[PDB]
Amino acid sequence: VPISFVFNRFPRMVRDLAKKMNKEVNFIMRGEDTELDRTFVEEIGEPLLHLLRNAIDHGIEPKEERIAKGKPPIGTLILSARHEGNNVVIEVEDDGRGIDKEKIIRKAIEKGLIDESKAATLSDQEILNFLFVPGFSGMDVVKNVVESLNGSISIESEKDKGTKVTIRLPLT
Numbered sequence: 823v824p825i826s827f828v829f830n831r832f833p834r835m836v837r838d839l840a841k842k843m844n845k846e847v848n849f850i851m852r853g854e855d856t857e858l859d860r861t862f863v864e865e866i867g868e869p870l871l872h873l874l875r876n877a878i879d880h881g882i883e884p885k886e887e888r889i890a891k892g893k894p895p896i897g898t899l900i901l902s903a904r905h906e907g908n909n910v911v912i913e914v915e916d917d918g919r920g921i922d923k924e925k926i927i928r929k930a931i932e933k934g935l936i937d938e939s940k941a942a943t944l945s946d947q948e949i950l951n952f953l954f955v956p957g958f959s960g961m962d963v964v965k966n967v968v969e970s971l972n973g974s975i976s977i978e979s980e981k982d983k984g985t986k987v988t989i990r991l992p993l994t
């Protein structure tokens with residue numbers, strides 16, 4: 823089943839959200855011929871739509887803010903699919919404001935999930951994986967779907983640079 827069956831509905835959703843949110847977004851899709859099982863195609867749309875929404879709302883900054891920070895004025899959102907062996911890898915990348923890891927740590931300490939003492943030596947992945955804790959901010963819901971497809975998800979993010987969410991699906 824080509825993934826384009828899912829990806830083809832996204833330019834409309836992205837442009838509707840950009841408009842309602844007053845962002846300017848350059849949306850690029852790559853790898854849309856990538857084939858995978860019908861069950862995956864039927865289920866992956868919801869979690870991707872959530873990731874695209876997060877990027878437009880929380881990641882990409884309004885154009886005035888990007889200019890004020892010396893970034894290219896219009897933010898860019900790239901959705902990509904490819905094969906890596908017998909697995910399909912889907913990426914959602916934006917060049918927005920990124921995730922503030924300090925805020926994550928503060929929030930985790932408030933919620934009683936980590937000691938201040940242990941926050942100093944947390945890895946980058948340890949910190950960002952708090953976002954998957956249920957009720958932390960829902961990245962939990964994204965992970966729940968990916969998990970039910972026997973996939974995995976990771977986040978990479980750096981403040982002011984942007985965010986890349988990666989989803990790895992088995993052949994099934």
Ligand SMILES: Nc1ncc2c(n1)CCCC2=O
Pocket residue numbers: 876877878880881882916918919920921922953985
């Ligand atoms: N793409 C993207 N960029 C920023 C953020 C998110 N996703 C979700 C967490 C909140 C946040 O700040």
